Amino acid sequence: DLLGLFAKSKLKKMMKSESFKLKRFGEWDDFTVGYIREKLKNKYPDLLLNYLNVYKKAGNEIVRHANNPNKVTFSN
Amino acid sequence: LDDIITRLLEVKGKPGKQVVLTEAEIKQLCLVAKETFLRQPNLLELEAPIKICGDIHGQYSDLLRLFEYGGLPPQSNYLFLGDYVDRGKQSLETICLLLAYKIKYPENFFLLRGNHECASINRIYGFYDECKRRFNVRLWKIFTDCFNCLPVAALIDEKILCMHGGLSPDLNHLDQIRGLQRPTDVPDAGLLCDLLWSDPSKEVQGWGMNDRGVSYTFGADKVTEFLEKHDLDLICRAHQVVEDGYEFFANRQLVTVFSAPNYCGEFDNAGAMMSVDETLMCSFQILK
Ligand SMILES: [Mn+2]
Ligand SMILES: [Mn+2]
């Protein structure tokens, strides 16, 4: 009789405690966002968007190079 | 079965508001198109020149206007971005023609999955009823099985990424689209859902919960970051009615193309198509 990572008791604690929240987000990183959203069961959207917009950082890592020398332009 | 397929095209190439095909013919288009979709990858790798259309929503006569403007296949190549059915009066003519041209010119003619090529949606927003009333519900399931195989995105000269909806918080590398398992329904959440459902937002930065009730909004920040990270120049998507038929987002790093003029006889919007030439110069043909 344990709790899952996405137990409601834990989501509430995350709402109430920044340090607790950060620790759990640490673990949310082991999952896809799709997985997480299904787990949240349409509650705690504030947690999910905070996770997505504040805690998660995007790179500036370029991960792809296109072999096409063309570049998109728009006509008049 | 190339003789059958051209008679089918010929006959569909005619206006009206009644059936002209048999159930068995429509069944055949669905079988053969399905096999064609499954041969080709789920992330399409296309070359310009090519003409790109957004939502049609059963507005068959407008679909014919678009082929007028652009040239009937294979005079031009086409990529459609989904939403062939629902809301309009003539979804069947619309999808049957599109599937016929896919089978006919498979290297020159392409169709992506829209969020309306999904049973739980087109159940409700008209297609199921159009099927029942003009044929039967069995023909609806046949389309469903076909739609479940529709490819999901397309990359044009490796620089323009096209999908019906938008970006995903789970879209970290493009090969993830290639790896999406095909005969599928659209799940409630996750990559495939977001590719068909997400929207750009001018009002909300980053990721926001989509008001539609599934998936997300993404801000101009997400677009900028995504194009920089994946060395892309443009995102081309549909899914939203826009007054002028096309509409730029995030310093023109994204464009929304909606091809159904005067949607539902109500919106008074223009429809658009985007032509991409060999140099990736993009231009827009408008329908009012
Ligand atoms: Mn849509
Ligand atoms: Mn629409």
CATH number at residue B134: 3.60.21.10
Cα–Cα dist B199/B23, whole Å:
36
What is the CA(A61)–ligand 1 centre distance, in A?
Answer: 32
Confirm whether A68 is domain-assigned.
Answer: no
Confirm whether A71 is domain-assigned.
Answer: no
Confirm whether A38 is domain-assigned.
Answer: yes
**Angle of helix B127-134 versus helix B91-104 axis, rounded to 10:** 90
Instruction: Tell me if B167 sits within 8 A of B194, measured CB to CB.
Output: yes
The structural domain count of chain B equals: 1
Cα–Cα dist B85/B264, whole Å:
12
Domain hosting residue A14, numbered range = 8-55
How would you label A62-75 residue by residue, b for 16+ Cβ within 10 Å and e otherwise? eeeebebebebeee
Query: Which residue in A has a C-alpha nearest to residue B216's C-alpha?
Result: A49
Inter-chain residue contact B170 with A34, CB threshold 8 Å: yes
| Stretch (H or E) spanning A66 | none
Catalytic residue among B57, B116, B164, B239: B116
Q: The tokens of B183 are what?
A: 């005969």
Cα–Cα dist A15/A45, whole Å:
11
| Stretch (H or E) spanning B250 | none
Query: Which residue in B has a C-alpha nearest to residue A75's C-alpha?
Result: B283
Q: Which bin fits B43, alpha (ψ -120 to 50), beta or left (φ > 0)?
A: beta
Cα–Cα dist B81/B166, whole Å:
11
The strand pairing partners of B246, in sequence order, are B257
How would you label B20-36 residue by residue, b for 16+ Cβ within 10 Å and e otherwise? ebeeebbbbbbebbbeb
**Angle of helix B137-147 versus helix B127-134 axis, rounded to 10:** 140
Cα–Cα dist B143/B31, whole Å:
9
Confirm whether A44 is domain-assigned.
Answer: yes
- SS3 assignment, position B227: helix
Ligand with an atom nearest the CA of residue B163: 1
Q: Among the residues of chain B, which ranges form H helices?
A: 2-12, 23-39, 60-70, 91-104, 119-125, 127-134, 137-147, 175-178, 191-197, 220-229
Instruction: Tell me if B117 sits within 8 A of B85, measured CB to CB.
Output: yes
Cα–Cα dist A33/B215, whole Å:
11
DSSP per residue over B207-218, as a string? EEE-TTSSSEEE
Domain hosting residue B205, numbered range = 2-287
Ligand with an atom nearest the CA of residue B57: 2
A53: nearest CB among B206, B234, B280: B206
- SS3 assignment, position B44: strand
- Is the preceding peptide bond at B151 cis, omega within 30 degrees of 0? no
A49 burial level (CB within 10 Å; 0-12, 13-18, 19+): middle
In the annotation, is B164 catalytic? no
Inter-chain residue contact A63 with B158, CB threshold 8 Å: no
Cα–Cα dist B259/A72, whole Å:
21
Confirm whether A25 is domain-assigned.
Answer: yes
Strands B160-163 and B153-156: antiparallel
Q: Compute the 3-state secondary structure of chain A and give helix, strand, coil in percent, each to the nearest 5.
A: 50, 5, 45
Resolution for the entry shown, Å: 2.1
Give the determination technique: X-ray
CA distance to partner chain B, nearest, from residue A68 (Å): 6
Look-up: residue for tokens 């003789």? B3
| Stretch (H or E) spanning A33 | helix A33-40
| Stretch (H or E) spanning A37 | helix A33-40
A71: nearest CB among B170, B205, B280: B280
Confirm whether A64 is domain-assigned.
Answer: no
Inter-chain residue contact B231 with A65, CB threshold 8 Å: yes
- Is the preceding peptide bond at B49 cis, omega within 30 degrees of 0? yes
- Tallying the residues shown for chain A, one arrives at 76
| Stretch (H or E) spanning B51 | strand B50-53
Cα–Cα dist A19/A13, whole Å:
10
Confirm whether A2 is domain-assigned.
Answer: no
What is the CA(B262)–ligand 2 centre distance, in A?
Answer: 12
Q: Compute the 3-state secondary structure of chain B and give helix, strand, coil in percent, each to the nearest 5.
A: 35, 20, 45
Tally of CB atoms within 10 A around B17: 9
Cα–Cα dist B125/B138, whole Å:
18
A50-to-A5, A35, A47, B171, B259 alpha-carbon distances in Å: 17, 16, 5, 18, 36
The structural domain count of chain A equals: 1
| CA atoms in the 13 A half-sphere facing the CB of B170 | 21
B66-to-B63, B101, B281 alpha-carbon distances in Å: 5, 14, 20
> Taking an 8 Å Cβ-Cβ cutoff, which residues of chain A contact chain B?
32-35, 37-38, 45, 48-49, 52-53, 58-68, 70-75
Q: The tokens of A45 are what?
A: 């959207």
Confirm whether A48 is domain-assigned.
Answer: yes
Q: The tokens of B137 are what?
A: 């519900």
